[PDB]
Amino acid sequence: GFPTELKPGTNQFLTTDDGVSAPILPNFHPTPCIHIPGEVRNLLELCQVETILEVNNVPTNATSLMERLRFPVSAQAGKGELCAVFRADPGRNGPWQSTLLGQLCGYYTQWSGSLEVTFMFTGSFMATGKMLIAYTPPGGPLPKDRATAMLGTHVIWDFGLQSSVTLVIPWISNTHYRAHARDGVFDYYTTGLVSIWYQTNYVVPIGAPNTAYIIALAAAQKNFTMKLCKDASDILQTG
Amino acid sequence: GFPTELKPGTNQFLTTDDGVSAPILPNFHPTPCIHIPGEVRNLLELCQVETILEVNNVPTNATSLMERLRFPVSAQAGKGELCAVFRADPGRNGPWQSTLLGQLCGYYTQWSGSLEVTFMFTGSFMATGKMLIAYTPPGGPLPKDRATAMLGTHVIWDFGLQSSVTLVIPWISNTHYRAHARDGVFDYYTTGLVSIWYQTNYVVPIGAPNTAYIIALAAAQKNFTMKLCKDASDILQTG
Amino acid sequence: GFPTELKPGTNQFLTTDDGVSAPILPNFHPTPCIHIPGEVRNLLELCQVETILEVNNVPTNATSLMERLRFPVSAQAGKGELCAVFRADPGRNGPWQSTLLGQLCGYYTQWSGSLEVTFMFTGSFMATGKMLIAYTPPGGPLPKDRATAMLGTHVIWDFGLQSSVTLVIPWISNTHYRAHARDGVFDYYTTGLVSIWYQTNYVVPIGAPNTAYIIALAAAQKNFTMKLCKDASDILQTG
Amino acid sequence: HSTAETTLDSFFSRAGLVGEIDLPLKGTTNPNGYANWDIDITGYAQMRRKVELFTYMRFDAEFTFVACTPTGEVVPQLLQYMFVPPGAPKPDSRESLAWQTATNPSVFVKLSDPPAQVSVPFMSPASAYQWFYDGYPTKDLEYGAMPNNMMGTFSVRTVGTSKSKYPLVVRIYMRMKHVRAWIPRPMRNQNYLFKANPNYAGNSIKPTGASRTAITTL
Ligand code: NA
Numbered sequence A, B, C: 001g002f003p004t005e006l007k008p009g010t011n012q013f014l015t016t017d018d019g020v021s022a023p024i025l026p027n028f029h030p031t032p033c034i035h036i037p038g039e040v041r042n043l044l045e046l047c048q049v050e051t052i053l054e055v056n057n058v059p060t061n062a063t064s065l066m067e068r069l070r071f072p073v074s075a076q077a078g079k080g081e082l083c084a085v086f087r088a089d090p091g092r093n094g095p096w097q098s099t100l101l102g103q104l105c106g107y108y109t110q111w112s113g114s115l116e117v118t119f120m121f122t123g124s125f126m127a128t129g130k131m132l133i134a135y136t137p138p139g140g141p142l143p144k145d146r147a148t149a150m151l152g153t154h155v156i157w158d159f160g161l162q163s164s165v166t167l168v169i170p171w172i173s174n175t176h177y178r179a180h181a182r183d184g185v186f187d188y189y190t191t192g193l194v195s196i197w198y199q200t201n202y203v204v205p206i207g208a209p210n211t212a213y214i215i216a217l218a219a220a221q222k223n224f225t226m227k228l229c230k231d232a233s234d235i236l237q238t239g
Numbered sequence D: 001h002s003t004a005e006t007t008l009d010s011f012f013s014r015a016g017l018v019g020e021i022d023l024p025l026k027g028t029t030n031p032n033g034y035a036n037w038d039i040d041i042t043g044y045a046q047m048r049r050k051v052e053l054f055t056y057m058r059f060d061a062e063f064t065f066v067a068c069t070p071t072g073e074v075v076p077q078l079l080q081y082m083f084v085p086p087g088a089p090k091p092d093s094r095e096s097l098a099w100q101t102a103t104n105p106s107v108f109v110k111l112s113d114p115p116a117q118v119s120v121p122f123m124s125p126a127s128a129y130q131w132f133y134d135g136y137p138t139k140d141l142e143y144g145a146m147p148n149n150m151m152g153t154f155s156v157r158t159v160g161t162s163k164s165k166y167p168l169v170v171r172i173y174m175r176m177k178h179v180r181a182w183i184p185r186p187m188r189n190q191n192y193l194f195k196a197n198p199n200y201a202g203n204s205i206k207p208t209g210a211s212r213t214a215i216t217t218l
């Protein structure tokens, strides 16, 4: 016959070997595929789609869960007050957990790219005022006050003029490896921070509510990517 | 030698693997094939050949079996009476079981296409009258009366004018999967119905019989097909 | 290495597999073949060579064995008498067993083609007379008399005019399968018959013997063939 | 849109179980450590009716031998599968010289080695096998017998002069290949009674299919 030598690895079954195997029904002709709208070909498409960011991940009371989808701004607040704050950490526990992006990061080990967060003011039309949205790069600590926050990267948002505004997180990278307890994780450290401050007070005329809500939508930019598949979940098929 | 690695599946015997094996008599030269008339190359050819449809699958008495091959029309019947009725279900138990088409469906799991049923009036030449043959698509229920049957797809057949007439079942599809008892079958639901009604009474002159028979022939159309081979039969080779 | 899957048949030893095996003496150079006269390349060559047909397979007495090689014709015989008779059955027991053709048929299972039998009269030169050699195709029964034999295929042989004459058995075919006792053989049924009759009496002058012998030689024609090798013999190497 | 599954080759593909040879240690059954299985495609129940949809057929066959003990256990035993072609004498004893006749192809294999597999050609001296023969081979008991359909015989046995230490079973699977058929005919609708003929139980003549109460009630 033809001379051969079996090499190590012979007979092994590697769960990730993508070889070819004998067809059970060789004559079977699968019904043909037709066109179905909305095919997805790469998860990154979904990652780029904005979903609601539960910045207000505070109430746990079952009947208040819907409140996590929006945070408020009110007349009561005084100019300069810190409104809300959160970090740009898609893969870690927190607000991003509500985003489809955060959820998908959970199926991977490493990732990086730019992010985008859009804030939608849903108060009355008659309501006006200014908010200062600021990004503090990684390492930098939450600004003591509005004043110092203003010295950094920021946007003065006049919800009297425009109802939405989008902030861009230039770069996040979950690559630095850690080996804490005895469980080795691949965590950020690249936690940039987004702080929202009242620049002016909430201004409203007679007859307009004194509290309005902001909805935050977020997604990854086109330069975003993920590596090392990692199946993990608390939600698994039941017995 | 030449480096090789045996992969899973090595040494298995798959009853449906269509590989090649060593020839027992390498020098033997089989007598040559000559031309035999009537070669069949695809069962679908046989499926398209009309065979008798036992619409009248009622008598079981051994000496009356031949009666199942034909149903009657008579003087006695009054205009409007329902003559006979059957469903377009080649693969299921019933009249189609007599047809070669029905029998072949039994060697498969799924199928679809158009059907054709030809009705042959074999009464006297002197006999005349009209019958209304109607097709009620799947879902639709057997028509209450001739009147309503007429509102649907139908053919007014004058056996005074033409002795045969062919109805076309536009489409049947045995694809919907079922899991009843504990035995999972792939059944129709696409049971369209063919109902035959007396439009006029049977008219005959003195000396002509008052009962005549109709023979039903059926077959699948050219757009017919079958999938998933399934060997099944009650008639098996004996011990 | 290179991915492989061993298939059924792996490791088996099939006595008729004509594969290739490792050479024991790779450097050995066999003495070269020279030209030897008389090479045979296909047994069919030998089958076409005439050998003596023991039509007279009667005497068994050791010292009379040579008599089987020839049958006689004599003065004593009267016009019309049946001289000898035999069937055209190369592969079966009987006269053909003496022929090399018959012997070779024994190494095969099936065969067919035309045959040829040449009769050589070896009587005195002064002797004269006529014999009627007749072939009765398969199915046909030995002719009652010369008269009826003459109605069929035949040759009037005048051994006064020509000393040899050749008859052609148009066709024999040992293909019909049989399963008698419990041993399944592939027998003829295509036994055509060759009958030899005295047309005239043996005529001789004073001084010439009153008995002469005929030698029969036979062989297969060029359209002859054999199938299915079958080693069989009573003559085997001894202990 | 495709129609490959309804081709004759598709309809007759697959390797089915056609034979089962039992080689017990103690027993009434096959007491001589050998067995002769004449090739019968009818071994797979379902086959008879299918091939009989046609009058004439032509094909090759791939035979696969799956051997083990009655518990499916694998043991260190050498076996011999000898194919004695039609016209050849089958062995009559564990010591028959037939087992040694070269013209009977034999495959020697270990029960540990994967299944043995070989191909058997169209053997008939006729142009095609034929399931029906309205005639007699040159009232009678020979009616309908087409002998020229013999495919051959497989003689199975453990190797050796002494009986095997183990109880064995050899299952024979056959895959038809290169199929051709002619003259289709009505499909058997009455149960079979005898392997060799179409005889049907005249008392129990059943209707081709199911029945109902009246022709007007579904
Ligand atoms: Na390797």
Ligand code: NA
Residues within 6 Å of the ligand: B019, B020, B021, B022, C007, C008, C009, D117
């Ligand atoms: Na193979």
Ligand code: NA
Residues within 6 Å of the ligand: A001, C019, C020, C021, C022
């Ligand atoms: Na070799």
